[PDB]
Design a protein around this ligand. Structure first.
Ligand SMILES: *[C@H]1O[C@H](CO)[C@@H](O[C@@H]2O[C@H](CO)[C@@H](O)[C@H](O)[C@H]2NC(C)=O)[C@H](O)[C@H]1NC(C)=O
Lengths: 49, 29
């Protein structure tokens, strides 16, 4: 896992280019991706950790 | 309603005259 550097990532079959940082937001247990108003992924949950 | 900031290459550029500056002009007039 990498934090705070721009990187090409794939999380459970979702591919995006972004900078990864820890967030305060608490996801619902069943859901994995997070999406904003404009339908761009804003948060992701790593399966392993 | 609510880093370039906007995923799809969308950027907002700040106005030449700031909000504070415009108020000063209004005060002057
Ligand atoms: C899957 O395996 C990983 C890696 O062994 C587990 O992660 C660890 O979990 C323990 C107990 O919660 C922690 O104390 C460690 O810090 C975690 N990391 C490692 C490297 O051990 C994980 O708990 C396991 N199970 C899942 C995700 O279901």
């Amino acid at each position: 896992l990498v934090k705070n550097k721009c990187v090409n990532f794939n999380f459970n079959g979702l591919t995006g280019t972004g900078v990864l940082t820890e967030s305060n937001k608490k996801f619902l247990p069943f859901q994995q991706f997070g999406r904003d108003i404009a339908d761009t992924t804003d948060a992701v949950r790593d399966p392993q950790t | 309603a609510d880093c370039a900031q906007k995923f799809n290459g969308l950027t907002v550029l700040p106005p030449l005259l700031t909000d504070e500056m415009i108020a000063q002009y209004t005060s002057a007039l």
